[PDB]
Amino acid sequence: LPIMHDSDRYELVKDIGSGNFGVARLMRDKQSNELVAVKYIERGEKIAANVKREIINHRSLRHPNIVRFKEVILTPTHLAIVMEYASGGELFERICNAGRFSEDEARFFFQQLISGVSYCHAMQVCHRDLKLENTLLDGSPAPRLKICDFGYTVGTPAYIAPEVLLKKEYDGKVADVWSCGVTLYVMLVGAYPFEDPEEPKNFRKTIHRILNVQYAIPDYVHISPECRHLISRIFVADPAKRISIPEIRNHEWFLKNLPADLMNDNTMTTQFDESDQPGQSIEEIMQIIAEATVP
Numbered sequence: 001l002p003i004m005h006d007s008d009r010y011e012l013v014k015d016i017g018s019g020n021f022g023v024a025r026l027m028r029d030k031q032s033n034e035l036v037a038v039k040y041i042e043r044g045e046k047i048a049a050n051v052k053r054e055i056i057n058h059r060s061l062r063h064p065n066i067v068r069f070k071e072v073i074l075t076p077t078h079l080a081i082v083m084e085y086a087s088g089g090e091l092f093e094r095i096c097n098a099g100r101f102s103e104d105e106a107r108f109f110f111q112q113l114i115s116g117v118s119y120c121h122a123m124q125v126c127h128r129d130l131k132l133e134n135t136l137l138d139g140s141p142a143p144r145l146k147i148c149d150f151g152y153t154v155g156t157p158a159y160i161a162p163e164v165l166l167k168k169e170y171d172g173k174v175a176d177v178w179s180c181g182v183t184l185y186v187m188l189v190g191a192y193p194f195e196d197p198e199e200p201k202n203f204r205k206t207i208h209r210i211l212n213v214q215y216a217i218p219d220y221v222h223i224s225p226e227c228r229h230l231i232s233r234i235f236v237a238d239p240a241k242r243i244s245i246p247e248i249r250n251h252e253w254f255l256k257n258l259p260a261d262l263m264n265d266n267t268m269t270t271q272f273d274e275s276d277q278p279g280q281s282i283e284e285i286m287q288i289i290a291e292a293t294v295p
Contacts, residue, residue, distance in 0.1 A: 001025060002040055002077045010036075020134050020148045026085060029070075032276035035139065036070055037085035039152045040078040044295040047079060051152065052289055055081065056282065058150055061123055062274075064265045065116035066147045067136070071278035072288050079292040082278075086146040088137030092186070100190030103224055107256065110184050112145040114254065115262045117180060118245050120149060121173055128172030132179040133159050140270070157206050158182050158192040162237045165211065174239040177248070181234030189221055193235070213237045226253040 001023070004012050013026035013035065021037040028035050041047060058069045073080035088094075091109065095101060101109070113135070120130065130147065133155040137143040161178035163170045185193040194209040196202055209215070213235050217223060223231075230253045233243035248254055265272035280288075 002075055005075050005080070006073060020090075020136060021083075021085065024085075027082075032273070034070075034277075035085045035087055036082050039081045039083070040075075041081065041152060041292075042078055044293050047289065047293045051079075052286075054150065054152065055285065055289070057124065059282070059285065061120070061149065063116055063119040063263065064272075065112045065145050066119065066149060068277075069150075071280050072285050074288050074292055079289070081152055083150070084146075086136035086148075087139035088143055088146075091135045091137055091145060091183070092133070094137060094143070095187055095190060098190075100221065101187045103188065103227060104257070106184060106187040107227075107253065109143075109145050109187060110180070111254065111258060111262060113147075113180055113183060114245060114248055116145065116147045117176055118249070119263070120147070121176070121245060128170075128175070130172075130176050130179065132176075132183050135183065142269070144270075156192055156195060157203055157210065158194045160210065161239070162211050162213070163239045165207065171239060173245070174242050177234055177242055177245060180248075181231060184234070185215070185217075185231060188223060188227070189217060211237070224253070226251075226256075230254070 001015055009030055010027040011030055013028050015025050017023040021039065023039075025038040025040075026035065027038055041051065055069065055072065062068065067086060068084040070082040070084060073082065113132070117130065117132075121127065129149065132147070134148060136146040136148060138146055157165075159179050159182050161170070161175040164175050164178075182193060191198065193215040195206045215235055217228070217231075230243075230248070230251055233247075233251075236242045243251075261267045265274075
């Protein structure tokens with residue numbers, strides 16, 4: 001990792017190398033007070049077109065449930081890519097610590113999940129790039145879900161829709177619904193839907209159950225019919241018959257206690273100001289990117 005820089009606007013919090021941000025540096029923005037994660041790319045090295053487009057595409061995503069891009073900084077050594085850091089650990093860990101969530105708590109997170117995924121579907125041009133298994137939580141005492149859309153260890157096949165395993169072509173949006181259903185199930189049950197109950201992680205057995213949409217909610221987990229219905233409309237092997245995101249938004253289970261401030265960062269209890277963010281112009285960013293090609 002390069003030496004600390006811009007210590008006038010950022011404080012060094014901790015250098016890490018494990019997680020959704022991978023080898024990164026945690027810092028705290030002294031002006032905005034936001035915790036961020038800085039990723040470094042060697043100058044004139046991977047400063048390819050792919051990096052350029054990932055930054056540009058990601059910059060446009062401004063939803064409270066998606067890990068935001070903050071800014072790019074040139075150091076005399078690497079390109080610094082700064083982004084929001086989710087410090088609450090993985091959604092999955094919270095589920096494990098609780099054993100399983102109640103219906104109400106699962107709904108609270110599922111609402112956020114759907115709002116975020118729906119926003120990605122509208123903003124992104126080519127889809128098929130959502131890693132819901134590694135969804136994170138922010139550090140707030142009232143957990144906000146954070147989807148990670150970037151990449152500058154693979155998990156359960158349960159998350160992989162049947163058509164993603166078999167068919168050569170598929171609609172990424174419909175596959176994402178399957179993934180959200182897997183997340184919902186795990187929240188409500190405390191284990192994955194198609195994997196062998198617990199002890200064995202037999203990928204051969206999991207795949208087999210996935211393709212045959214073989215799942216069973218255990219007897220001790222009491223679920224409302226609305227909820228149960230929603231699950232049955234998501235775990236459908238045929239993609240053309242799988243409920244869509246907009247239909248999930250109109251489902252009775254999803255509509256109960258739907259907070260009005262789902263898409264807002266700044267609310268009555270949560271502070272956020274876009275003008276405190278280092279909102280660089282796309283021209284400014286491109287300047288730094290090209291200027292970063294010079295070693």
